[PDB]
Amino acid sequence: GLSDGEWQQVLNVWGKVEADIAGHGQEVLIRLFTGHPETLEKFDKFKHLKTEAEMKASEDLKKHGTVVLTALGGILKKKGHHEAELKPLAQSHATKHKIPIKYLEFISDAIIHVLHSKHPGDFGADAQGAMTKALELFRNDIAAKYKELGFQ
């Protein structure tokens, strides 16, 4: 788990996200899609996006980025006590959306990249350690639900 001090860092970093949730969400998804084009293919409603310019210009992508980061932020504020929030996300992503756990690894990495890119010099070594732990916990708890479903 995370220490209280680590959770405090996580939620302090998250305050940065909340100042522009759509902008952060958009950049995370663009980072995912551009670094790993296979992920774009899981989104019927974004596979029409052929270029990063089109991605950047997509208001619906920004909207989805808001949905995604709002869900994650709710989960993080539970500080690990997230079974009720996390279980349904794990199940929709395995059974409906067919998202292998690797892609959750990719988006976790994208979140770390975007934080540095949008806040250069303001996402310190302690903060990165804490956020990384929180994202691994999230990923690891999803992985447990995936195993339950025999998904992947």
The residues that touch ligand O=N[O-], with contacts defined as CB under 6 A, are: 29, 64, 68
Q: Residue 31 or 127: which CB sits closer to ligand O=N[O-]?
A: 31
16 belongs to the binding site for ligand COH (CB under 6 A):
no
Site string for ligand COH, 69-88 (x = CB under 6 A): --xx----------------
114 belongs to the binding site for ligand COH (CB under 6 A):
no
For 13, the token pair is 């970093």
How many residues line the site for ligand COH (CB under 6 A)?
17
24 annotated to a ligand binding site: no
For residues 130 and 110, is the Cβ–Cβ distance under 8 A?
no
CA 107/CA 69 separation, integer angstroms? 11
Quickly count: other Cβ atoms within 10 Å of residue 134's Cβ.
25
Closest CA to 105 of 79, 140, 78: 140
DSSP 25-58: HHHHHHHHHHH-HHHHTT-TTTTT--SHHHHHH-
Contacts to ligand COH by CB under 6 A: 39, 42-45, 67-68, 71-72, 89, 92-93, 97, 99, 103-104, 107
Q: Which residues does the annotation place in the binding site for O2?
A: 64
Q: Which residues does the annotation place in the binding site?
A: 64, 93
